[PDB]
Ligand binder design. Structure first.
Ligand SMILES: C=C1CC[C@H](O)C/C1=C/C=C1\CCC[C@]2(C)[C@@H]([C@H](C)CCCC(C)(C)O)CC[C@@H]12
Length: 121
């Protein structure tokens, strides 16, 4: 298993947990001091607030998440990722681009540390 495949597997699980409507499970995939920065929108800091974000999307009926990993570079205990995303809202397409950093755990699992994303118009 390569680094890209490892990240792709991590995101595949992310998708499954989201689709099970388990916002806490989604939030566990982040470091506690992780942060999401949606450009031209309010930053989201810490796992607790990140859980609220994903719970909010669930509550709004947002579905069918897809996260396409384009490029991955492993650097020390970090993995640097470029990708795209697409979701569906009540059906409305919600899509865009992101870059993000994962941190490898002692257990060998990857967790999200930093995400920067932008929504297409
Ligand atoms: C349009 C909606 C639905 C309606 C709401 O009012 C505003 C809004 C939020 C969507 C968000 C903003 C935060 C950043 C999000 C959550 C993106 C993620 C950060 C994308 C990266 C996902 C991952 C796991 C690869 O790292 C996807 C949708 C984006």
């Amino acid at each position: 298993q390569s680094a890209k495949e490892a990240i792709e597997a991590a995101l595949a699980d992310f998708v499954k947990v989201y689709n099970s409507k388990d916002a806490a499970g989604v939030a566990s995939k982040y470091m506690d001091d992780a942060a999401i920065f949606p450009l031209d929108m309010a930053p989201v800091d810490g796992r607790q607030n990140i859980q609220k974000l994903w719970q909010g999307l669930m509550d709004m009926g947002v579905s069918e998440p897809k996260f396409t990993t384009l490029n991955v570079q492993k650097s020390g205990d970090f993995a640097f990722e470029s990708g795209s995303f697409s979701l569906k809202g009540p059906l409305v397409d919600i899509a865009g681009i992101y870059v993000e950093v994962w941190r490898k755990g002692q257990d060998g699992g990857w967790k999200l540390y930093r995400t920067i994303a932008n929504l297409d118009p």
